[PDB]
Chains A and B, each alone.
Chain A
Amino acid sequence: EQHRRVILNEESWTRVMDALSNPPSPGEKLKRAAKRLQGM
């Protein structure tokens, strides 16, 4: 049972709930990693 059941505290829960309603815009670093993945 290695991180297959995330039992979130109320604050950690809201962070996720909020990440789903307001999804982060992919940053410049992540976009670079995705450009590398394209060429493979």
Chain B
Amino acid sequence: DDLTIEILTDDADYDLQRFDCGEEALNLFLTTHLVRQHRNKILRAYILCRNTPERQVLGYYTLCGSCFERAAKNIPSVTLGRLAIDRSLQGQGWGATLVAHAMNVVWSASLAVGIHGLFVEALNEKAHTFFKSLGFIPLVGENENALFFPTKSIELLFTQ
């Protein structure tokens, strides 16, 4: 394939304006907020692009260190806040590969510093069904739009 997955490279230019994943909020995020937030260390942006000097982006994901706590104990984790796949690549299994690439980053970081799980943001029902098909455990009530995958399950995937 022509396509590659990499962390945004700080001193490079990407073709972003043409991107359309079918949800204006994600498109907008990519073309006006993703680069500034990555460079300011707000989040860690990862890109699915064509591997040409022109570097045409066709999908992305974001990562941020986080920690889950309860009410009335803390768990250090990583959150995948945003995931997007351009229309052209939809129905081609690319989105799941991005989650798998995400899982390999989170695993690597657990091996270095000690991270216990991966949390994900599911804003609409179509995404909720996606991460559930990837084995993500759905959370309830106030935590509805969150699903979790343990590091141990991630370890199994690339070790089994």
Contact = CB atoms under 8 A, between A and B. Distances in A.
B143 interface: yes
Contacts of A12: 139-143, 146
Nearest to B142: A9
B79 interface: yes
Contacts, number: 131
Interface residues of B, number: 47
* B-side interface mostly: mixed
A3 B152 contact: no
B148 A16 contact: yes
Interface residues of A, number: 30
A10 B157 CA distance: 29
B59 interface: no
Interface of A: 2-13, 15-16, 19-20, 23-27, 29-34, 36-37, 40
